Design a binder for these strands. Structure first.
Ligand code: MG
Ligand code: MG
Ligand code: MG
Ligand code: MG
Ligand code: MG
Ligand code: MG
Ligand code: MG
Ligand code: MG
Lengths: 286, 286, 286, 286
DNA sequence: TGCG
DNA sequence: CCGGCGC
DNA sequence: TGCG
DNA sequence: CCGGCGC
DNA sequence: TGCG
DNA sequence: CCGGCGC
DNA sequence: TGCG
DNA sequence: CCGGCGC
């Protein structure tokens, strides 16, 4: 009897395999590997073997794997988090955003004022130069919480009426919007330069919030500890990073005796900067 | 009224009145007012009248009122938040800490590593000069969450076992500590210089976290919108400020026709920077 | 006592003595000490003795000493920095900002846009609820650099004309404002809570600048290493702290056997977080 | 005679052309353009014509253009800044730092302590989890200042000896190392995701400094105002961005009547977020 | 080369 | 480090 | 189409 | 968005 | 009159 | 702005 | 205590 | 920690 989160984790991997997102080409290179690097090549191959990947196909265009990885991550989060309603109740929505959504975050309570800022800037110069446009934050995946009725708040006891706790964020109707619960950034693979946009997006969420900061996490299928470390090490922007196949990564590093990579892997794991994709749903329930 | 949060809000005010924390001296100065300040005096008197305050006594020493205000705010939050278990379940603890101990936050999961940094600085001077020492400063009041047993996670379904979600923060078992849910800073009265330690303490919680940022809020009995604004305006450090008698403050500003102060009050309230103490328990449930 | 900076340092101390800013009251408490604190009391008296202080006077009101300390520090900086024209040329101005605080900062190039932000907010609601108000920063003392004419830029060679380097900050020309060189915060004495406004003011200068960040320093007469450390330890907001009588503080710490204070003193000094007032003029020439 | 800075700007451009860094391929795509983007293609062609580019050759590998652009920008800054000794005297060094040099930054005074942090982490595995690792990242190009002899400080008057201003940063004494004057980040072209490492690197310089923050700027050859805005808008990390051919960009934007892009250009330029490469040497002299 |  | 290009 |  | 690969 |  | 002193 |  | 009050 495999527990349900183990079953969900396997379903997550299976979607990556069935869609040929994770596969091997005819030159033996696994699709999340950097073929110019011996350790990346071998680590990725070991992980794919542990995942029972058998398909041989050409590496998909990066735009395709990028988008598909976001979608599959979203489905896994939605399905697993749904089972935690008893430890973190709520009317939750999980969705892949899509760069098409400029100001999508302004539809949520903690960032609704960005609409007013944007509207004011579209009429004022150094307002625009000073405020910027990055505040136009667009997470890859977001988890949101819908507001609740007074009868839900009062389900067991008469706690509130219309003249008390009148600005509480959870109360529906104050002309109020849903709450942003989490920003989940996805990276199929990593290069240390381009991975830093997870930090700038995290800082924008920190700097502009009105209310509690959403969870800010990164999920990645990057095989190398060194590249993972470019976003996982350090604190202040990113809450934690989650690897798509942590157990398998650990097993391959141990098997091949890649001592330095192993040392770095444990610095991140023991240092609470890196976890497995299966840890994410429960971490979203704190 | 009869809603329980309304009763609890009154119990909070009554504790302040009964302990002479909020009282009026024989010169007519209410104890949360700046007697040299005309508007402070009048706004504070208006609020005391709406709270039905009648006791005449000398102002208590600032150390006494500061500590009592923290204690009374702690009791209000504990009492009210306990009623929201169906909206935000968990084994919650609310406690007044402050200077009773430094590095108290290192007792919690997201800041556990500060103990190691302090030990390292203890053996290497420099580290101390670069790392600083203020990361050891404890919030006036903290709300914490104890960890969960597998029996509870698996209350309705078989979700986890020892080989899946092994790093999830909520799971009890590997020396992992409880989670810090909220930092609640209290200020009986405000001066714009000394109010800024709430921003530096908030920034330290932001910069050093591993995991989701706790709620970071300030509760105050300061009567003037100008002084309240010295900590409520701006974003990035403080989630929101909660006033001890917001409805009364609004009413008196209207009655006195202090138009500029009323305008600032509304900028803060409509701008989601200022709410009533009764909004805090529900805001801790998002 | 031959070199001019040594003579200037002595003049600085003499102004503090002559104005009764630094004096000893009837209870033997020196005016920069906390009489309830044995270490503060003894350290401050030792320093006063090394400065050859003999005046007895009751302690000046804090508003008076705060303002006088700012004025005297400003005069020391102006006089000493004036002698470094050969290593840091320019048309420099040093001034205690004072009462006409708000937006003086916006007269300078790197922060001129703050005026636009303030005007916009005035004509409309929230904006200030997001943007805040503390950005109308008012440093205690500022050092500014006036702009240069082409004749000077082209003193030795024909480097520029009207069609090249047209946006260079240093070029005098309708529209261009003087540059803010330094923000010098003064604190006659310190309490750990109120000292934090130096960090928030420093962060505002960092976050809102257009151009190179000005020097951000703090000058203080606080006698105890513990209180000095509440602003000197750590990095990110304050470049460095300068003590009004560092050599004397070190000598008395050596004589008194307060080993924890001596250790803290050296962590800050060896750690480049604390220097002497005489180091400031040269540090402003980098 | 054309001004020497105008002549320097032309030499800068000539080096880009002679090395085929900036050229046009046989399909009409200029080497700093995004061939798939009509507006990018046209703007880049317009600029190339204004620089009188006539060479037809295939685009160089990105690694090649990236390194060459760094080298060429370094040579321009060194040559032009050397002519400003009368406005900003000193013993200056300008050098392209190879990604082949981590902790080169710790060779400089304001960041020397990073070596001690790195050694502490090497023996305290785990500390790296919190401290991070990128704090060892060195800028693409750095400008540094050697320390000054007391002979020069005392050139005209006897200002200092060994018992006064003993911790001054400029004094070639306290084992003190040279000072970091500027961090110059280069980007031949931009994509909004990879442009963000300039912000994370800038933040590391802000957060870890002891002393005055160095200049932090970006130089780019990106043709589109939209992509330039991904790094130029906003304040706090980057002092200002400098475009390799600003005058030409503006001219072609007008000739093609790209209204939105022109609006954005002026917002960045009037908003002091974007200047010409010719403005950089003088801006480094403030 | 490795990784920016 | 930058370039290509599919969603 | 343009752009993450 | 990710992938290739030269300094 | 009220910030610092 | 700084000072006093109960916590 | 000295400090928050 | 807050209170007093000069500038
Ligand atoms: Mg994204
Ligand atoms: Mg992504
Ligand atoms: Mg506190
Ligand atoms: Mg407090
Ligand atoms: Mg000040
Ligand atoms: Mg001051
Ligand atoms: Mg670089
Ligand atoms: Mg670069």
């Amino acid at each position: 009897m495999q527990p349900l989160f183990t079953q969900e984790r396997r379903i997550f991997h299976k979607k990556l395999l069935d869609g040929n997102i994770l596969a091997t080409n005819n030159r033996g290179v696994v699709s999340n590997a950097d073929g110019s690097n011996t350790r990346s090549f071998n680590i990725a191959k070991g992980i794919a073997d542990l995942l029972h990947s058998e398909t041989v196909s050409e590496r998909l265009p990066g735009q395709t794997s990028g988008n598909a990885f976001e979608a599959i991550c979203s489905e896994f989060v939605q399905s697993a988090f749904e089972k935690l309603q008893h430890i973190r109740p709520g009317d939750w929505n999980v969705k892949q955003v899509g760069s098409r959504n400029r100001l999508e975050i302004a539809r949520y309570q903690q960032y609704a004022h960005l609409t007013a800022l944007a509207k004011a800037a579209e009429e004022n110069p150094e307002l625009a130069a000073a405020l910027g446009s990055d505040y136009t934050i667009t997470p890859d995946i977001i988890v949101t919480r819908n507001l609740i009725a007074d009868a839900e708040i009062n389900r067991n006891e008469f706690l509130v009426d219309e003249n008390i706790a009148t600005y509480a964020s959870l109360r529906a109707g104050n002309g109020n919007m849903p709450l942003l619960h989490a920003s989940i950034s996805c990276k199929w693979t990593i290069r240390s330069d381009r991975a830093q946009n997870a930090r700038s997006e995290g800082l924008n969420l920190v700097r502009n919030r009105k209310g509690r900061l959403p969870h800010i996490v990164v999920v990645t299928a990057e095989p190398t500890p060194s590249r993972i470390s470019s976003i996982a090490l350090g604190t202040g922007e990113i809450d934690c990073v989650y690897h798509f196949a942590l157990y398998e990564l650990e097993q391959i590093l141990q098997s091949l005796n890649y001592e330095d990579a192993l040392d770095l892997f444990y610095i991140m794991v023991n240092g609470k900067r890196l976890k497995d994709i299966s840890d994410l749903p429960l971490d979203l329930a704190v």
